[PDB]
Symmetry: D2
Subunit: 427 residues, 4 copies
């Protein structure tokens, strides 16, 4: 026996819940006692999940707004933080298309193994940690906080409340700062911009949001919980059992047993209000990037929860210039921030940056061989004045940090890496 | 019992060795019966490994030369093939830096789990397969062979001859076409352009190459085997046991017991000749991109093995414009090709494309939010004239393909995905 | 391009479906052309999946009946075969409790990652392939077929028809011979002997069986598809949309929106008949091990489908002697076989053997240290007259096979393993 | 930025090394400043590793001796603890044979992916945590510490000092309490009781032990570091550079370049003395279970390091009764303990209990079907008086724990598992 990791008392938890401003608008339908009962006799400390959640929350209140780009590899997250961003978005869509545990390429329908996003959260954290270790030994203060908070996609939870619970717990173990959960049927989950969506009853999503906060409380971390509604476009729901949903039920039924329901901003506003006591940020998927519709939603929701922060998906699934002109595109995010959209993100930023850059390099390489690659290397060199450091790739991935480990173990090692390298001699 | 997967008899195998031109210049120090002894009573078919190896060998003989770019994600390989490339290079350096099974970022020192590259080989093939499947239902003939052969990094084998064997078997199970192996001490392995390299005796690498060939025979696939030598820059060797290495041994020793050895192209040529009978292609790492030095190595080897094909690494570890003028850079691969370097590749192409593109997007996003992303999207729409297809990311990852699966199971499903998607209504 | 892996034409497929007795009683609501449309231009051969499926089919018709024990580790399966069993059962319950990819211990509620069972199938196959490779070099003919067919748990599909499709595809790539699918709501899935079960409509499960068949056809292997119904104990159903389910619907509903239904053998018999055209074997979970009830179910079903084979679960979830006496327990399987249950299995066999055996050893060890282990070693020595071979653990796991590979690569190697070993000198 | 995870100052660390008795006989050839330089700006807390290491250290000084059995699944560890054991042994040999990330069965030669043991360490902790959670809700005080410390096999480090460092880091992240490292060449690694062992220079093993301490220091946890020497039977060494090794080097070399060296207890005493300043425990592999030889090694080492604790492998690789008589077998561990062997373990206990228990079950099942299984089931009911609880497998894997989560989320859920279960109604 030991006292390392001993659980706090229910009294202690109740107290934090009652005094920490963090929980000011947070309703919990279970007790402090209930949380303790599930903690066993040892509570593991989740440093990155704690730090990340705390940082994210402060930024949400200290900045005009927090934006982010989707990252599907650790290096992507490193470049986003090097360029100055202060949060990382981990898209489940990108994980399905190019970074999931089945090894397959999938459309965004919850087809991949449920521990896939948690593994990428752990991966992004490992990469940021390596960047952080490297910055320290290089005396580089170019970046204030390498461990930027990660907001990750919990999709529709991959099942019922217990699958939701295990996903949240695994995201936390991996070091996530925030997670989002949507009101769709897991078995028919869709990207918000794909058709064929099936909502689940308002209450069921409340059970999901409740389960996610519960896993966060049992793991002793203040994870930011985000509720997403897919009701703007969904015309199906699994059941009419919930009276808050009935006003939209048409009565028509499908062969699968689903119910037709009237889609639009109205159902989104209703669900948003019902989810508000259980969500630190609320988000409604929309069919076009429209400041006016965004404002309607914002005023409507804040008219009942003035302090409710909102999230917005600046989706690559929109044909941006088909809808907006440069002036509006230019002010898009600043406008939204004014409305209360404090977390903004380009979900598929990484998928497109990766696919395009490689198509572009490879197309050139197919025509001119080395000339096309040299053009890129020169662009990298030119970007150094902007803060870019990866042209010197050995140090970027830690060659200098491992050299430090090697010489700490054996100062006389004759097998260190950077000394005598072409990096040291040509860059 | 059944007859499915019945092992060939030793005679059938001998016959192929004796009559297939593929084995024309291949020495096997073990016998056909030795192969059969290790096969048990059932031999799995490795369709992709077989097809990729067959296609790779053909292209090496049919094209002026075969070039490639390193890919670390499945989508990367899909873009390389979409852009017209006919082979994919899978760099172990890239896997160490952003795609390995430990989840950590590492310098190129064989620090990651030994099954990492095989997993990426499997991923790459899964992605090319999906592209293949999609092009079929889309009636897209723009690409003749989506399943481009993959040439992957076996580094220094992660141990002894048995570790080499297991890595080759795992690469094959995953569908690899070719694999390369270097003459370095596994426990001190380095990127060819890092310092602190340690060679192993000439005969030890012959054992490695024999092991890689044996695993391919026991698996019954004609995998391409590439032999790499790091003697150009390496100043240390593990032992002076081999008479062929003794000529360069200086007598001086390091505190770890390594032997100092004279590095240069002379040691490279000597090892290249020793490796030939056991190598489909031969590669020597160099400290600079030099057409001259390349010719020297080439003539020297062909002087004794006229038909021996060579491989060359157009490495991002070189500061290209610092050593060459645009005229030479532009003719580089063509020139090398005339010398006999039939397989050429830019090892770290993916690391740079991915890191620079995300840095460029993020920096612009950090300043001007959506304007920066819209610039990228317009670039993608512009690239469609060149054959780029990823702007429509839903179909790119298979939304239409899984829609076809869904409608084959139940043509009247009310939850298919492309109908009513923003991709349909906006692209 | 190459011709390796070219798909069969639609005509060829249609022919096999038309002439092979394997497809005798098999309904496909999709066409042969539909299958070809989903295969892209290359079809990977799945050697063990095909061989296993063919063998299992043959055995189901040539033996009195086929039995099996649940296997959760590769060695478990190897011992099962060594002892004479001719098939392996891969329980999802066991995967949940001690062998899934989350690393966590879980109750049987579909909480683990969807690719867990496929990984265990690949594991079992690799273990069997090693025992086969060893028996060969040892001249051991004690076993005719080391590659016993594996029957694996596909639970409730982990989602919708596309999740079922991917699970089946992954099971096949891993080398499975047959897979079973149940009519429960995946998000609320339960072990068949736990409470809180919820059925899905009859047509929805036909969609699941159709999807499982479609994936096998696309992969081009004769997988055995098994249908399981949970209607004997389930008192809940997601919807009353299907007319075949309505007769059992009571009208009462839960706050979740579920529908109460009347359970018993009646709904199981009706469901069994509906699934019959879509299942190579049918299985109904029961609350106790009752030969009467079993005959009751069998007669009903064969009354309409005479050639329909059934499968029976002799579950550890039953307190066997609390229900039956030794005479009945002794003939249990032989009787069931008469009734037409050609596949019988003890789902949690491995979990109990492993938990009990270790508690027993650890208990004695905590008391008597080495004496307790020696008691076990002597039992293993004793069991050698029965065929047991693991007392000699080094050769059991392949030390001798690998020594052969080492000597094939270098007959003079001074680092082989069995020579000089305590196994060779003390056993 | 946040305060969470801020690194300690070099001064604070130095102070700990200076005053904590834990570090009484520990030599660290690097500085505290060196440790801090490698920690970046945030240090993750490793609760289980910290707790387990502290607990194991206390136990080693509070109990007559600490013993254990090799566990290869989480359920085995659970049983070992339910049965009274206070430590768990994680064998690399068992991982190679039946629990490694490649999915393959291997002999003990460092063939599996290097992150395999860490994942098994994480699995065991997860399982023990599940039991701790269940015990708390069942109010079971039967076990005082479910989180028993785990001592894991680090083998030969899978490479150089950097591979050692990463393996140690990964073992800590997974929650290990102690790790052991042997003086063999990783590429030729062997189970201590197989032939073909190649030693590395005494100084190289000191480097390994130093790297293992550094990784624990950077991770901020007091991990128990164990040194193993294989010099009793090894007759080869990689180099003769170390003057401490030279008295045993014969001058004769093999064709691979290895040096022949005279084996025995003498060079083991020499190596142990050299390793003592860098090892919390020292272990020498022996060819037979000989209390006299044990005493000889023990006395020789303590003559110079009286407080040095020792470890002993009661290997299943020995034919116990062939060497010892019942009386000695009975007092074996008690005697060793008196000599100073405070950690004793049966490396392959899990392998044997698993392989034997299944073969037995399967053999009896192939003959008497249900009768055989029934025999096992009553034995389990019988073992309940001794403290066994797995007969009731649903609660054993957390069915009741997840029911608690379910009702915490929704008290009115109609889909909980234990109510209406055959376990509840028949056990
Ligand atoms: Mg998403
Ligand atoms: Mg490489
Ligand atoms: Mg099951
Ligand atoms: Mg070991």
């Amino acid at each position: 026996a030991s006292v390392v990791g001993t659980p706090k008392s229910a009294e202690q938890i109740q107290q934090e819940w009652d005094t920490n401003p963090r929980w000011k608008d947070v309703t919990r339908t279970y007790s402090a006692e209930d949380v303790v009962a599930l903690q066993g006799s040892v509570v593991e400390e989740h440093t990155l999940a704690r730090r990340g959640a705390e940082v994210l929350w402060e930024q949400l209140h200290d900045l005009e707004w927090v934006n982010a780009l989707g990252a599907l590899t650790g290096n992507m997250a490193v470049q986003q933080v090097r360029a100055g961003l202060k949060a990382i978005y981990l898209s489940g869509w990108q994980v399905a298309g190019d970074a999931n545990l089945s090894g397959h390429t999938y459309p965004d329908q919850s087809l991949y193994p449920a521990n896939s996003v948690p593994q990428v959260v752990r991966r992004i954290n490992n990469a940021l940690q390596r960047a952080d270790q490297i910055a320290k030994i290089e005396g580089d203060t170019s970046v204030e906080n390498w461990l930027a908070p990660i907001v990750a996609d919990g999709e529709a939870g991959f099942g019922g409340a217990l699958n939701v619970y295990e996903l949240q717990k695994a995201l936390i173990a991996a070091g996530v700062a925030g997670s989002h959960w949507e009101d769709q049927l897991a078995s028919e989950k869709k990207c918000g911009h794909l058709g064929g969506k099936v909502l689940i009853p308002t209450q069921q999503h409340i059970r999901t949001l409740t389960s996610a906060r519960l896993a966060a409380d049992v793991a002793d971390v203040p994870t930011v919980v985000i509720a997403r509604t897919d009701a703007e476009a969904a015309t199906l729901i699994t059941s009419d059992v919930d009276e808050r949903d009935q006003p939209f039920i048409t009565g028509e039924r499908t062969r699968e047993g689903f119910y037709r329901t009237k889609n639009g901003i109205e159902p989104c506003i209703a669900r948003a209000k019902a989810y508000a006591p259980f969500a630190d940020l609320i988000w409604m998927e929309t069919g076009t990037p429209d400041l006016e519709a965004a404002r309607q939603f914002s005023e409507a929701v804040k008219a009942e929860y003035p302090d409710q922060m909102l999230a917005y998906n600046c989706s690559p699934s929109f044909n941006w210039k088909k809808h907006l002109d440069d002036a509006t595109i230019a002010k898009f995010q600043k406008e939204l921030a004014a409305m209360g959209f404090k977390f903004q993100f380009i979900t598929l930023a990484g998928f497109h940056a990766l696919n395009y850059s490689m198509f572009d390099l490879a197309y050139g390489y197919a025509q001119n061989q080395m000339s096309a690659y040299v053009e890129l290397q020169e662009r990298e060199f030119a970007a150094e004045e902007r803060g870019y450091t990866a042209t010197k790739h050995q140090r970027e991935v830690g060659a200098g940090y491992f050299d430090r480990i090697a010489t700490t173990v054996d100062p006389n090692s004759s097998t260190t890496a950077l000394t005598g390298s072409t990096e040291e001699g040509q860059f």
